[PDB]
Write an enzyme that holds these catalytic residues in place. Structure first.
Site, PDB file in Angstrom:
ATOM      1  CG  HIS A 187      34.285  79.025  -3.537  1.00 41.82           C
ATOM      2  ND1 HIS A 187      35.531  78.749  -3.043  1.00 41.82           N
ATOM      3  CD2 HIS A 187      34.533  79.892  -4.802  1.00 41.82           C
ATOM      4  CE1 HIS A 187      36.304  79.453  -3.572  1.00 41.82           C
ATOM      5  NE2 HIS A 187      35.422  80.141  -4.573  1.00 41.82           N
ATOM      6  CE  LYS A 515      41.303  84.482  -0.271  1.00 41.94           C
ATOM      7  NZ  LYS A 515      42.850  84.051  -0.664  1.00 41.94           N
ATOM      8  CB  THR A 594      45.910  84.445  -7.400  1.00 41.98           C
ATOM      9  OG1 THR A 594      44.485  83.682  -7.980  1.00 41.98           O
ATOM     10  CG2 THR A 594      46.576  85.351  -9.001  1.00 41.98           C
ATOM     11  CG  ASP A 598      49.137  88.444  -7.587  1.00 40.47           C
ATOM     12  OD1 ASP A 598      49.299  87.523  -8.259  1.00 40.47           O
ATOM     13  OD2 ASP A 598      48.111  89.167  -7.643  1.00 40.47           O
TER      14      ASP A 598
END
Ligand SMILES: O=c1ccn([C@@H]2O[C@H](COP(=O)(O)OP(=O)(O)O)[C@@H](O)[C@H]2O)c(=O)[nH]1
EC number: 2.4.1.255
Length: 701
Positions: A187, A515, A594, A598
């Site tokens: 991940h 990120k 996600t 948004d």
């Protein structure tokens, strides 16, 4: 009763263990203990293979023996800790770690494990400290280094960043070449400059960990359905997730199981986690044809049996390598066709997975070599969001005018129209190229709203209508704040609530700070510098990252007031306050997934630069589906230019906001009914192919 004999047995089992023959090793260790039971080393060794095989309860027993026989055995304490940690007894695991450190202050492994405990419990500064200590005691310590690397990544500590990324690659390269399990998690690999090959290899190595844990069960291959006769012509689809509840995954796809066509499909939802009492978990249980709680069937053997007995044709993995995953279920292959979907932005790299559901934008055929699964394309984007259902009150907005902006003071509400019609003089501003933005003028009423906001009040009443302060939704209706219910009041949202300037361009990014990398911040500084009348809006996500980001921001010549931080908010507030931003600058390293859906639901244009990894291409995929190819940058310079234009050319900005504002409804991006139908079509290709006797192959329409 001979120790020299038992010792020879132990030496031999180590051999069998390195050859990868785990099963014979166990037999030899057990032989050593039958000869000489007070053999600490044998207990400790047998324990760690039992731990590999997922036989935790029994490994714990042998670690304890190893400890009784040799009380100075810090290595056994530290391992027993890992076992307890895996058994969800973190209290007992912590005790094992600290006790090893007490006995041997210089024992690096125990410090690394203690750090991991803090890392899991969100205590990053503490984890960072213990990792540094482990590395001081043992400079060549990959697991510690790589985890520390991720901790630094999380809080945006870029000290010696370039050199760090170089050492990570060197570590993975050396481990793969020596056939070891890489210290980098699958991940996390998406965050480092590893080759596509290296990432897939990491994933594969990790997927193989499930094999020792299932091989122990000694299960035969399952006989899968070759037709749909026992299911009355219905394709049986199993969705496996640990996130049926208040989790991002449910915020994306909760509406899907109920939108499946009962004539052709029979939906089985397999929950890996227990009921958390939220409406999300309530909806999926109510709308799926069958809802099975596998959290109560801990044995992967008995759990896979259950799946197989239900007769699943297509089994869908929504966890991949994330928290709560139980890929041992897929390793056992209880279904003829098993696909990756939505939850994990990467490849499993494993044999037990056939397809990865994606699209041509996210995973173009030329980079099909970063996946191990066969590609299965959705017509537009594989990404879906349930915003149309969760936040319908954000479908229309209205502003207040203070001497006209569309994002300084905003009203949303299911009853917003009836309230406006009660006002005396409302101006109706048109959006060109059926859509309008009502404007409440600075009146005695418009002043009372501002008032409530400035005084920090919870709510007021105007002409019988209930007007709510956007900051206090959780005191008015907690279910509405989480997204579980649609708000029943008209909510007010302003820039003043978050300390945003009323006269400035607002670039936003609501992602976790991990990120962001140095190259991205530099890109954003270039923009802010070229658009002096602007600020960057970020979240304390986590808060400890704020001082780090600010520090680098000033090294680039940005005064403090240029970047503005806000705290993480409840779902509904988070989505709603996106309306306040002018533009969203997407992170190129790992896009907002996600988070992307948004900002788009608020009608906020998002600028992105697609990379090579799936994680870095989701945003562009979302945008093309929406219909905004002019927000997609081919390189850093075009990214900076696109953002600088939206910031300086006000009509161009107005035109693009108007685009996203309309297309979020008109495009198929937030259309869960269409998406489900496309998904169903994709399934039937998958099934027809398999029933026709073929093995998995790419699915490009
Ligand atoms: O102020 C905030 C910022 C984030 N979120 C939510 O937190 C989740 C972020 O999870 P994740 O990092 O996985 O987002 P992704 O990577 O998928 O974009 C999303 O559901 C957001 O809606 C939130 O509720 N309030």
């Amino acid at each position: 009763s001979c120790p020299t004999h038992a010792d020879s047995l132990n030496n031999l089992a180590n051999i069998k263990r390195e050859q990868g023959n785990i099963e014979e090793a166990v037999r030899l260790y057990r032989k050593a203990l039958e000869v000489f039971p007070e053999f600490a080393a044998a207990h400790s060794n047998l324990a760690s293979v039992l731990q590999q095989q997922g036989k935790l309860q029994e490994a714990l027993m042998h670690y304890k023996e190893a400890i009784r026989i040799s009380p100075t055995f810090a290595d056994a304490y530290s391992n027993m800790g890992n076992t307890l940690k895996e058994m969800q007894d973190v209290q007992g695991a912590l005790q094992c770690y600290t006790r090893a450190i007490q006995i041997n202050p210089a024992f690096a492994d125990a410090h690394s494990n203690l750090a991991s405990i803090h890392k899991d419990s969100g205590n990053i500064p503490e984890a960072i400290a213990s990792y540094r200590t482990a590395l001081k005691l043992k400079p060549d310590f990959p697991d510690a280094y790589c985890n520390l690397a991720h901790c630094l990544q999380i809080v945006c500590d870029w000290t010696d960043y370039d050199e760090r990324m170089k050492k990570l690659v060197s570590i993975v390269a050396d481990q793969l070449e020596k056939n070891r399990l890489p210290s980098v998690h699958p991940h996390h690999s998406m965050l480092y400059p590893l080759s596509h090959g290296f990432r897939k290899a990491i994933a594969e190595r990790h997927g193989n960990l499930c094999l020792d844990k299932i091989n122990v069960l000694h299960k035969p291959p399952y006989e899968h359905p070759k037709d749909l006769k026992l299911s009355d012509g219905r394709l049986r689809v199993g969705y496996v997730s640990s996130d049926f509840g208040n989790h991002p995954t449910s915020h994306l796809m909760q509406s899907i199981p109920g939108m499946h066509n009962p004539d052709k499909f029979e939906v089985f939802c397999y929950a890996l986690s227990p009921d958390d009492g939220t409406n999300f978990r309530v909806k999926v249980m109510a709308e799926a044809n069958h809802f099975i709680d596998l959290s109560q069937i801990p044995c992967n053997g008995k759990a896979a049996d259950r799946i197989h007995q239900d007769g699943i044709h297509i089994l869908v993995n929504m966890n991949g390598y994330t928290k709560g995953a139980r890929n041992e279920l897929f390793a056992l292959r209880p279904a003829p066709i098993q696909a990756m979907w939505l939850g994990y932005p990467g490849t499993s790299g494993a044999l037990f997975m056939d397809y990865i559901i994606t699209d041509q934008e996210t995973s173009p055929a030329e980079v099909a070599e970063q996946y191990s699964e066969k590609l299965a394309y959705m017509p537009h984007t594989f990404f879906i969001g349930d915003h149309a259902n969760m936040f319908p009150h954000l479908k229309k907005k209205a502003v207040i005018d203070f001497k006209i902006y569309d994002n300084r003071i905003v009203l949303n509400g299911i009853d917003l129209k009836a309230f406006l019609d009660s006002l005396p003089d409302v101006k109706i501003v048109k959006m060109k190229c059926a859509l309008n933005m009502p404007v409440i003028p600075m009146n005695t009423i418009a002043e009372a709203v501002i008032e409530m906001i400035n005084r920090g009040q919870i709510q007021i009443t105007i002409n019988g209508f209930s007007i709510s302060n956007g900051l206090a939704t959780t005191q008015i209706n907690n279910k509405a704040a989480t997204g579980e219910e649609v708000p029943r009041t008209i909510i007010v949202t302003t820039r003043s609530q978050y300390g945003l300037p009323e006269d400035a361009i607002v670039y936003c990014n609501f992602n976790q700070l991990y990120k962001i990398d140095p190259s991205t911040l530099q890109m954003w500084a270039n923009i802010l510098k070229r658009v002096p009348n602007s600020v960057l809006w970020l979240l304390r996500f986590p808060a400890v990252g704020e001082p780090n980001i600010q520090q680098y921001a000033q090294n680039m010549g940005l005064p403090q007031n240029r970047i503005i931080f806000s705290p993480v908010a409840p779902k509904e507030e988070h989505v709603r306050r996106g309306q306040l931003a002018d533009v969203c600058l997407d992170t190129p390293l790992c896009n907002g997934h996600t988070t992307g859906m948004d900002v788009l639901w608020a009608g906020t244009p998002m600028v992105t630069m697609p990379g090579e990894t799936l994680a870095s291409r989701v945003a562009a995929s979302q945008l093309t589906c929406l219909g905004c190819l002019e927000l997609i940058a081919k390189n850093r310079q075009e990214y900076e230019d696109i953002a600088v234009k939206l910031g300086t050319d006000l009509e161009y900005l107005k035109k693009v906001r108007g685009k996203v504002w309309k297309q979020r409804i008109s495009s198929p991006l937030f259309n869960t009914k269409q998406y489900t139908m496309e998904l169903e079509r994709l399934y039937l290709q998958m099934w027809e192919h398999y029933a026709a006797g073929n093995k998995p192959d790419h699915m490009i329409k």
